[PDB]
Amino acid sequence: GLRQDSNGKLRYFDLTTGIQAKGQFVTIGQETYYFSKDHGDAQLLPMVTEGHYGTITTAWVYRDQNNTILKGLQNINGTLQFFDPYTGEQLKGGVAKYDDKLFYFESGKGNLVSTVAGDYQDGHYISQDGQTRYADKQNQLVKGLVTVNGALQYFDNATGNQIKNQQVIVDGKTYYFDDKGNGEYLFTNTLDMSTNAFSTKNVAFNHDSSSFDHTVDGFLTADTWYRPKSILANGTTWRDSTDKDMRPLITVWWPNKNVQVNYLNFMKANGLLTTAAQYTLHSDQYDLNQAAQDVQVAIERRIASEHGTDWLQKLLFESQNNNPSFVKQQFIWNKDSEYHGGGDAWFQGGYLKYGNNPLTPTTNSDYRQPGNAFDFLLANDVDNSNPVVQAENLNWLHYLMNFGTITAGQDDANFDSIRIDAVDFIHNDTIQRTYDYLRDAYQVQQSEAKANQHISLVEAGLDAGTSTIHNDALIESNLREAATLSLTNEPGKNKPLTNMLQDVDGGTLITDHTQNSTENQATPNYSIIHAHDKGVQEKVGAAITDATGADWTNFTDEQLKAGLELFYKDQRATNKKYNSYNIPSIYALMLTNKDTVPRMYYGDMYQDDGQYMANKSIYYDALVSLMTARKSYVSGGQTMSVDNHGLLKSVRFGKDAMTANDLGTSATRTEGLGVIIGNDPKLQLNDSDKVTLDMGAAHKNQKYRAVILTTRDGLATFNSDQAPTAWTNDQGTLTFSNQEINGQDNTQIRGVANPQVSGYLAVWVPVGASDNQDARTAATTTENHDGKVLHSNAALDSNLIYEGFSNFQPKATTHDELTNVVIAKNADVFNNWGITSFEMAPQYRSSGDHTFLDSTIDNGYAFTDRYDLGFNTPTKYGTDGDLRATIQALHHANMQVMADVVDNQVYNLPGKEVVSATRAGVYGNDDATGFGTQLYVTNSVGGGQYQEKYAGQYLEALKAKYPDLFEGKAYDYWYKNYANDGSNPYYTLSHGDRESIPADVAIKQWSAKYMNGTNVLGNGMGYVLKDWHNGQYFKL
Ligand SMILES: [Ca+2]
Ligand code: NA
């Protein structure tokens, strides 16, 4: 070990190999020394006790017992650190010179971990032989572990090839080098194990499963206990082990030196070793190994004293004194070694993509191809490319589309249509096959009569190319996004309303409102401003976190209630910090524009500081008046322009009048409407200027009356002809000005700032409609020949969807407050507004696990058992009985009912397995991180009682009735291409070929073989134990 030479100089010789230590640091008993690179002579580095870490103008520094700033190399608390010799600023993640040699100080704590061969600033990279290399100032290849322009980097010693996206062992230390070759230290490896007689007795009794616990799929974990050959009873007397003897693996074996060091120091601090001896990353391994064997003595004495091991379970594996457990304190066994986050880690810290390993035959897969623009989002990502999962998705769809029949023999209690949740995150083949189901079951492709009985929609725009190719479902129009530019912002922050003249998705036209006199041209679409998520969840989220301090995905009912109070107070004020401006105007656009199906959001009409439908919003009357006027008056062609005062003027002509010169039928006279919208609350007209609405040739010399007028304090609303009136001239033009018409207040145009309008809003309809005029157009049975399921025409436009929930509804405190009970009770209210399609929330039982917003407010999107729609105990919305009664009531009130189909993910599956994992982002793209690729313990097995009962149960019958669904099939779809030069995305026609699928394999419970991946779980890169020297996993 430590030995003096002839002259009394101290030198060090490794305790196992006998190799002299030179140019390195060694801890010996209590002291840490450096041994010079020349003669190997010792220099004692004094232990710094007392003193504290601080800051300076902001840079961390370290001050001694009496407050002096320390400079240079320092031995602090059994670590070596380096502080700039001028500023005293601590170095972290870089090199410093000592003894004219370079040492690296890791980025986490600034601890000295290694020697670096050289530091380079003046050479240059080259490409040779298909590799990247680095040439120094003399144009000579650089080799080994070096720093280049301040980055730690590694060039293969033999070739000079730079290493990228790999973990590399250099001189006994393990590093990761990223996609640019930029490195980071991970851990110091253990040299080699004791081979004394003591160690031979710690060896495992055998390799059988019964010798180890906390195993998964035959692999060992950090939590594993094992049966040794022998037990040092009470620390003194070796005996053969029995089948009742188990000891933690981590009392005898460590994955790296950091963990062994931390282990000895932890056991020190908890009374199982007392010694002046310091244990550091510079300790001789021989001493560390012996120290661990000595801790065993003290462990065995305490096991004899306490007649058991429960104290040791707690000591190593539970939180003690509000600290993480010993295991969880270790880098390789915690989230720090998973490198969470990144721009592609949209939720939950990001994702782990599953792959294959020869040692994991039960979780391997031949599939896992995303087959769409996106892959991961949340929780356990379902592999919807897998043929067995595709069959299961058809099973579940059929279940939902026959839920009343299936569960109660009630054929009037089944869902009619679907929303495809997270459509761009699931494989195109399952989307195409889903649309074939609906074609097979309901003949939607035969005519609008059938298609319009089953109006489905997806959560995407024009990028949902499987949905647009044959318009099997509505895509979302660009109105929301356009309105967010020009209407929803505070004064001074809106763009001009000219962006509302065309509805355009990344440069592609969905529909043009300017002079729309045609049909069957627009892409069938739905228009919204808000939804349960969109435009909402992160604004409430901010009132919550602001009033409370909680995070937007995880809070208590009490903190939520508080945030909602602030939220609604803000909503009802003119000056809004959290809430959207101009909401009634935007609804006016939605509810009068041609060539769309509008969707009403529940939360724009009702407030979540009340139970379902209890508290009307400030906008409620305006939206009711607009839905009422839509049903009575809205039909025919559209025109739209923005005048010289910035006012948007939108006219609908009435039934059968497509252009401004058409006369239509006798019905036309009393149909049509005009809308004037401004976004300038300071608008003032001069005395001579006019604002005109050109109502058209069917509306000459005609009396109009208001639906909506802008007032000082809000909006005046009128649902009858008893309203202020105005007259068209002999050309059909209504004329407004800065003066009132016939002394009628609020008939003049002027900008206004108030809680319901920030700019100007007026809606005018012809006087004289009969009490139940209905300007809607019925669907016909005429056959389609163009290949499209939905067609954007007067009949499709006559539909109206209601999204009948909000995330932030409170839990019901009584049966009568339950959402689904209240919906059934109020079914005629929806009919009277003209709702034709009732979009219910996802009805699946919430996992309740608080791992995301959806599983904290229990909205139905985060579930374990996708067949459990409220059996035994209710969901947030009611029981399975309450659901059937709701669907019944809606149907008897002439509405279709939408099932929110969530194929993307499953939450909270308790059964564990082991699968190969790499970090990935939403796109399914591998991230270059330190975690690399590791076997990983996943929470991947489960489902629930209803998945067990129903999954796969319908497949044999479905293959008999609709055999085509189980065949392979060629199909086309549109594919969104993004341009290099920053010009608009463009669409190309892709071909797909879905596989044949089986009907005889059920997914009764989920497992990893059927998943693409999972959100990161925080277990670490090395929770599944292996030999880090050679990468070999332990396996029973
Ligand atoms: Ca997915
Ligand atoms: Na050694």
All structural domains of the chain, each given as residue ranges with its CATH number in brackets, are 1-188 (2.10.270.10), 189-350+1025-1036 (no CATH), 351-475+899-1021 (3.20.20.80), 477-897 (3.20.20.470)
Measured from the alpha carbon of residue 195, the closest ligand is 2
774 alpha carbon to ligand 1 midpoint, in Å?
43
Centroid of ligand 2 to alpha carbon of 191 (angstroms): 6
* Ligand 1: centre distance to CA 902 (Å): 10
**Measured between alpha carbons, how far is 645 from 684 in angstroms, rounded to an integer?**
9
Q: Compute, in angstroms, the gap from residue 855 CA to the centroid of ligand 2.
A: 51
Ligand closest in space to the Cα of 15: 2
For residue 282, give every residue at least 6 positions away whose Cβ sits within 8 Å of its Cβ, in sequence order, or none: 24, 25, 26, 27, 32, 80
Helices (H), 334-464: 387-401, 403-408, 428-442, 448-451
Residues in Cβ contact with 799 at an 8 Å cutoff, skipping those fewer than 6 apart:
452, 455, 597, 836, 837
What are the residues whose beta carbons fall under 8 Å from the beta carbon of 572, sequence distance 6 or more? 618, 755
Alpha-carbon span 856 to 849, nearest angstrom: 7
**Residue type present at position 231:** I
* 124 CA from centroid of ligand 2 (Å): 38
Report how far ligand 2's centroid is from the alpha carbon of 111 (Å). 21
CA of 427 from ligand 1 middle (Å) equals: 7
Total Cβ atoms within 10 A of residue 310? 10
Task: Please give the Cα distance from 434 to 789 (Å, whole number).
Answer: 14
Q: How many angstroms is it from 249 CA to the middle of ligand 2? A: 21
Binding site, annotated residues for Ca(2+): 375, 381, 425, 904
Specified resolution (Å): 1.9
Q: Is 62 helix (H, G, I), strand (E, B) or coil?
A: strand
CA of 787 from ligand 1 middle (Å) equals 29
Q: Is 46 helix (H, G, I), strand (E, B) or coil?
A: coil
If you measure from the C-alpha of residue 382 to the centroid of ligand 1, how many angstroms do you get, rounded to a whole number?
Answer: 6
Distance 862 CA to ligand 1 centre (A): 14
Q: Exposed/middle/buried for 357, CB within 10 Å: 0-12, 13-18, 19+?
A: middle
User: How many Å lie between the centroid of ligand 2 and the Cα of residue 288?
Assistant: 9
Ligand closest to the CA atom of residue 351:
1
Q: Are 20 and 40 in contact (CB under 8 A)?
A: yes
Q: How far is the CA of 102 from the centre of ligand 2 (A)?
A: 22
Nearest ligand atom owner, CA of 289: 2
Q: Is 725 exposed, middle or buried (0-12, 13-18, 19+ CB in 10 A)?
A: middle
Cα 378 to averaged position of ligand 1 atoms, centre (Å): 8
- Using the mean position of ligand 1's atoms as its centre, give its distance from the Cα of residue 934 in Å: 21
Q: How far apart are CA 406 and CA 491, in angstroms?
A: 54
What residue numbers does the annotated binding site cover? Answer: 375, 381, 425, 904
Using CA atoms, how far residue 848 sits from 88, 559, 719, 854, 860, in Å, is 50, 17, 44, 9, 10
Tokens 């290099």 found at = 980
Q: Which ligand is nearest to the CA of 189?
A: 2
Taking the centre of ligand 2 as the mean of its atom positions, its distance from the CA of residue 166, in whole angstroms, is 26
CA of 265 to the centre of ligand 2 (A): 19
Pair type for strands 112-116 and 673-678:
unpaired
Which ligand is closest to the CA of 284, given by its number? Answer: 2
With CA atoms as reference, report the closest residue to 1016 among 554, 357, 348, 542: 348
Strands 112-116, 131-135: pairing kind = unpaired
Distance between CA 826 and CA 283 in Å, rounded? 76
Q: Counting ligands in written order, which one lies closest to the CA of residue 19?
A: 2
Q: DSSP letter at 469?
A: T
Q: How far is the CA of 431 from the centre of ligand 1 (A)?
A: 12
Q: How far is the CA of 19 from the centre of ligand 2 (A)?
A: 9
Query: In this structure, which ligand is nearest to the CA of 422?
Result: 1
Distance CA 1010, CA 380 (A): 10
Q: Which residues pair with 916 in a beta bridge?
A: 355, 935
CA of 959 to the centre of ligand 1 (A): 26
CA distances 553 to 562, 603, 611, 939, Å, are: 15, 19, 21, 21
CB 668 within 8 A of CB 657: yes
Are the C-beta atoms of 138 and 146 separated by less than 8 Å?
no
Which listed ligand is nearest to 12 at the C-alpha? 2
DSSP letter assigned to residue 19: P
Instruction: Kindly report the backbone phi and psi dihedral angles of residue 766, in degrees, each rounded to the nearest multiple of 5, phi listed first.
Output: -65, 140
Instruction: Please tell me the number of the ligand nearest to residue 287's CA.
Output: 2
Q: Residue 257 Cα, ligand 2 centroid: separation in angstroms? A: 11
Handedness of CA 887, 892, 893, 894 (dihedral sign): positive
Method: X-ray
Positive or negative CA dihedral for 172, 173, 179, 182? negative
How many Å lie between the centroid of ligand 1 and the Cα of residue 373? Answer: 10
Question: How far does residue 406's CA lie from ligand 1's centre (Å)?
Answer: 28
Which-ligand-closest: CA of 283? 2
Residue found by looking up tokens 């209504």 in the block: 734
| Cα(31) to centroid(ligand 1), Å | 55
Helix axes 583-592, 479-486, angle to 10 degrees: 140
Say if strands 475-476 and 525-527 run parallel, antiparallel, or are unpaired: parallel
- Residue 870 and residue 848 in contact, taking contact as beta carbons nearer than 8 Å: no
Virtual CA dihedral for 150, 152, 153, 158, nearest 10 degrees?
110
For the CA of 368, the nearest ligand: 1
Greatest alpha-carbon span in the chain: 121
Ligand closest to 285 (CA) is 2
Q: Are 35 and 11 in contact (CB under 8 A)?
A: yes
